[PDB]
Amino acid sequence: STPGAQQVLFRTGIAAVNSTNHLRVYFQDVYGSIRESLYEGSWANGTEKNVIGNAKLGSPVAATSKELKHIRVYTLTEGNTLQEFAYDSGTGWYNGGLGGAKFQVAPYSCIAAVFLAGTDALQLRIYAQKPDNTIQEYMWNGDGWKEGTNLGGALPGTGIGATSFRYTDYNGPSIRIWFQTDDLKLVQRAYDPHKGWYPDLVTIFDRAPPRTAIAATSFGAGNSSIYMRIYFVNSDNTIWQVCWDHGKGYHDKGTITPVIQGSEVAIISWGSFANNGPDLRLYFQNGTYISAVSEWVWNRAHGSQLGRSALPPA
Template structure:
C-alpha cells in the first residue's frame, strides 16, 4: 500500500487588483514606501501571511486617500471571519477540494486492500486436468483468528510430506515449512479458501516429519499424526466444539524408526483408527484406536528402509496397505486384511503381477464408491521417471495401469497425498518442481 503526502500550493495575489476595503474591526497599519506624504494602507492580516513585501509599491502611484477614507469605504458584510469574501470563498473551495481528494484516495486504498484480503490466496491456475492451483505459504489466513497467518519467510520445506482429508466439499491438506511449523490450507475448486495458516498450538514436530491424517463428519473431527525429535508418534486432534488439542497418543511414547513414514485410516462403521509406521528391523507396525484406547494390533511384513506407506478402507471391513519389500526391485506390494475370507492379512499379488516399480518414498492411495462398484487408486513416482506421478486403478474388480497423470513437474520423489471429495472424483496434492504445492482434481 502506498502512502501519499499532501503538498499545499502557495497562492499569488496581484496587489494592484486587491481591494483595500476593510471593516472597522481590522487593525490596519500605514507603511510609507514612497515618502512620508505617500501613505500605503496594508491590512495587518495580509502582512502577517506574507502577502505584503517591502518595496512592492516602489515607483507605483500611492493611493490618494488615507486611513479614515479606507475605514469609511469598508462596509459590514465585506469580510467573513476577518477575511475578504473573495479570499474566504477561494480558501473554502480549496479546502473542500483537498477533502474530496483525500476521501477518494482513502476509498481507493481501502477497496484495494479488501480485494486482496478477500482473494485469500496466492494460487494460480495451470493446465493439469480439470482443475488445479499452485501456492506457496505467503498469503494471509482467511480462517479463524486463532490460527496465525503465514509470512513471506514461511515456505514449504523441500521434500515436505503432505496429508490430505475431505473437508465438506473441499480438500484440507497439511505440510511442514522450512522453519519446522506445520501449516494447513483448504482448497475449494481452484482457489485456496482458507489459509495458509499455522496449525494453532502444534509444536515440536521434527524437521522432515512424516504426516498422516484421518477425519470424519466432513472434517468436523480431524486427527493429525507426526513425529517429534525423538521419533515418538504425536497425535494432534481437532473437534468443532473444542478446536485443536493434543491427542491421547502423544503420551503413549510409541517410537518409530527415524526413516519411517506414516499412514492412517478410519476403519469400519464404529470409530476406529488404524495407524501404520515402521519400527526396528523395518517391520511395518499397525497401531489401533478402539474403545477409547490405543493398542498394538498387528505386525506386518518387513518393508525396505524408508518405504512409502499408504492405506485405504475397502467395503465390508477390509483394509489395503501399500509398501515396498525388496531393496533391489522396489516393487510396491499390497497386503489386505479381511479379504477374501475375513481371516487376517494376505498378500494380494498386486506387486508381482503389476510390477509397480517405484522410488523409495511417497506412496498414496484413495478409494470411493459402494460395494457393487468400489474404486481404488494407488499413486507413486516411477523409478525411471522420479519427477512424474503414475497411478494404478482398481476398476471392475481388476487393476488397470500404469497411467502417468503428472509428467516431469514434481520434485524427484516428492510427497504425494490424495483424497476423494465425491463419487468418481479424486484430488491429489504434490510438491512441484518450484517447491510449491500443486493440486490436481480428476473427474472420472
C-alpha cells in the same frame, strides 16, 4: 518464489482430508511446524497462524478424517515416537493421546492412517515402520492405543499408503495397505471383515524408486465392489497412477503429472461413478514457485488437469 512459498519445506510431507468438496491440506514449514491450508470454495490459510503443532524436520505427515467433524494428523516427534494432532468440532486443535504411548519407530519411518469405514464409532488404524523394518499396525478402538497386527518387513523408509472402505453387503470395514519391499516392488496387503488379514502380498508395480512416496484412496463401495487408486513417484520424476476398477481389478497404470525429484504425495476422493463423479484431488510439489504445493484435479465434467498452482501460503 514468494515469501509464502519459501516457508514450505522442500519435499515436505503432505496429507489431506475432506468432506466431499471441502478440503484441508497438511504440510510442514521450514521451521518444523505443521500447518493447515483450507478450501471451502476459495483457497486460504497455510500461514504462521494456522499451525497445529510441531514435529521433527523431514517428518512424515499422515492425516485421516470423519468428514470434517473429526480430523487426526500423525507425525514423528524429535524422539521418533508417533504423535497425533486432533481436531473435533466444537473443541478445536489439541494434542491427541497417541504421543503418551511413546511408540518408538525407525527415524526414517513413514506413516499412514485411516478412520475405519461404515461405522460412526471412531476407530483408528495407523501404520508405521518399526526399527526392524516391519510395518506395525496401531489400533484405537475407544479403549486406548494398542499395537495390532504386524504386516511384515518392507524397504527401510518405504512409503505407506492406506485406505478403508465398507462393502455394503459385509459386516465391517475393509482395509488395504501398500508399501515397498526390499526387492523394490510395490505391494498391497488386504484386510476383509469376514476373513481378517489375508496372508498373501499382491504385487501392484514391479520396480519403483527406493523410498518413493506412496498414497492411496478408494471410493464408490458397493456390494462386494470397490474402486481404488494408488499413486507413487516413478523413476521418470512423475506421479504414476495404478487403477483398481471393480470388474477389471488391477487393469491400468500410467503417468499423471510431473513432480520435483523425491516429491511427496497425497490423495483424497469422494462421490462415485454412480452419482456424477468421482472427484479426485492430488497434492504434490512440482517446482511451482520452487517450493509451493501444487494441486492436480479429476472430476467427471471437467476431466483431468492441474488445479490450483500454488496452495497457500504461496
